[PDB]
Amino acid sequence: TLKVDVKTPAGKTDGSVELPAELFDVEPNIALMHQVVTAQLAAKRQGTHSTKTRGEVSGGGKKPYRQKGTGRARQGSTRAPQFTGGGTVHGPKPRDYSQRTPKKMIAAALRGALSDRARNDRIHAVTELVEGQTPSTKSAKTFLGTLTENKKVLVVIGRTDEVGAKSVRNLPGVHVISPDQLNTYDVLNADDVVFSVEALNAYISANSK
Amino acid sequence: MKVHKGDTVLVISGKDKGAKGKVLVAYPDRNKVLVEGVNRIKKHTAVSGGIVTQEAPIHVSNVMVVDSDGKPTRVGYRIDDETGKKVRIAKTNGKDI
RNA sequence: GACCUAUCUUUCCGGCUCUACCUGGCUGGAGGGCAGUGAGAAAAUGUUGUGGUUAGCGGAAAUGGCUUGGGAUGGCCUGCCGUAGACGGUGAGAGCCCGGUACGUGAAAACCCGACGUCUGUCUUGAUGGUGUUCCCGAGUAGCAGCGGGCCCGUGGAAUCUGCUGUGAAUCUGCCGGGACCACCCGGUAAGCCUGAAUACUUCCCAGUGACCGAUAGCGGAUUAGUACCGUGAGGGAAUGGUGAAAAGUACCCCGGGAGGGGAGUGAAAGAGUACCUGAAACCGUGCGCUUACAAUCCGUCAGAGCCCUCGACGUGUCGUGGGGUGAUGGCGUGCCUUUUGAAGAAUGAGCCUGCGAGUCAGGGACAUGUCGCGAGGUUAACCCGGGUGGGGUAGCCGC
């Protein structure tokens, strides 16, 4: 168990959250995380690359000239692969790259990534990114600057907190995610993870229950 | 375009940066203006011998409308509710131009 | 279910059914419900919805300093906006210069989706028993037979479904299915009809995306492209993108009939001149160095005289831990590939260069072998919910 002290945008500490060992003390598994991350990038990849085979290229139905007597190499189609403008052999065709990674591997990879941040004290908890119901990037930038000076930050906010999300959205290195969408790639890409208290509790509850 | 024929503009980019001049003609289709005294070319008129100096068009994003206070200004718009008009305003002073 | 035949309950007003009286009907018009353009009947017609589509408009913040440069959007240093650091453009990497972006805002008209009315239908007596060798319950139909078709099922013991040709029933004790067939049970009620959603697709229109192509690629088609051109015809079917930031596209003079060039200009650059970015190779010239006309050469290799060039130390040239170019002369020496017992082979293929041209991809597929997770268990499929790559989903599957 590691304790994260909840910071407020007014500069106060409101409370603590206790991190379960099961979720934030896991030993990092680099080979497992590598498989999970590459699988995620494979699923991102849209397979939309295509080429025409010798049957799909326009024309080419007729045998150009007689088999024998011309003194030229025999040819069956003007669209054979050796021809300029002919069909492509073993060229790209559209394909799905997604992988069916087991659930337990995906979950363990996320726990490993979050544990690595927790051990290095890179996990922060906050009541709100901004006070009130008016988005302000200036407030959020100042407050995040007090929390972390690193460039890339993963901000985990509940669905409802539109004003917090909008307030941080435009900052260059900041990435915003909901706690139910938390994933290894975005955690390992971030220098620091900043949780809304509601989002951190929601994540702990859905897992440790 | 937000710059019009007859406006006075300050050049903000190019060799003639800082030159004031008057918009002699506007080319909206290609976002260029011809400005008096700026971007002059040494053309070879061929007919009578001809080696004249003439203005060449400059990209409109290289000029800024000069406000009544002498200051180059981004232009925005107010609505005049009486006529439904849409009037150019200088974003520095809020005055019409 | 019809037909009978008890019982208990029920809006109002008619009108009719030869005459009253009971009593059945049938049919109007008032109260009241209950539906509606849909499968369940049809065609209309108002009002209304910051509901939608077909044009748009607004929209924060640097003329900031110094330096480089033709140009700053580069470097260095300050500040500002951000619900806007999407993507473009602008004289070179721009959130703050421009089109925009976030976010807001807007429709006279037409069209589309509603809601609400009119308007149109429809209903208004229902519950409750008994009773019976009574009537009805989709006929050229079912069934059956011959020859076929199709079903996991290729005629098979061949059911079920179905075409053509014959033959041809029962109305509930009926009839048809439960893989020949029979019996018994079970299921169902053929030979009338209609029916939304879950599913398939994209000529065309709108908004986007890419570990897709980038001019022999990508569509055949970035260039008048289904054009030129070929064919009587069906039909076949190409090739051709880049000046520069700006055309400022070279006034004028000189040689020449022009073409082309030389001065002079423009440009940061004409080592950018409409034959134009970069400008490889084959291939074709000019100049310089060495070499070669007594020689028999797979064209090179290892020794190597002489000459030319260059780098060191010394001195006038001469030597070195040298390095290059050429090379008299001596030794050695039978192309490459394919295919063959064996090819320099007088077997096959290649005139030359540049570019292109061949073990790829899909599937919880199969066997094996690495690696990672979990482990007597492992795992989900479809699908559901997330603008994602995440969460859920036990049907299955594989071990036991």
Place this chain on the structure above:
RNA sequence: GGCAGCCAACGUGUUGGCUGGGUAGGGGAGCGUCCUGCAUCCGGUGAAGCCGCCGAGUGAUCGAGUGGUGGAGGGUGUGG
């Protein structure tokens, strides 16, 4: 005198013994090219490409070593 494979002997990678012609073919380990996740660096004070020089590695090859040409992108590390 240099390199390599197998094995031994010990050590926190060196020493020794043996071995290293090769077509079909099997196994192992690498070079160069492009597109990309992430991290870093160079570039109008001149990137790529191209032509050279001077050098480098056991090979594919290399040069964040340098001239010329050129005008806007490129390198490196670790993964896909």
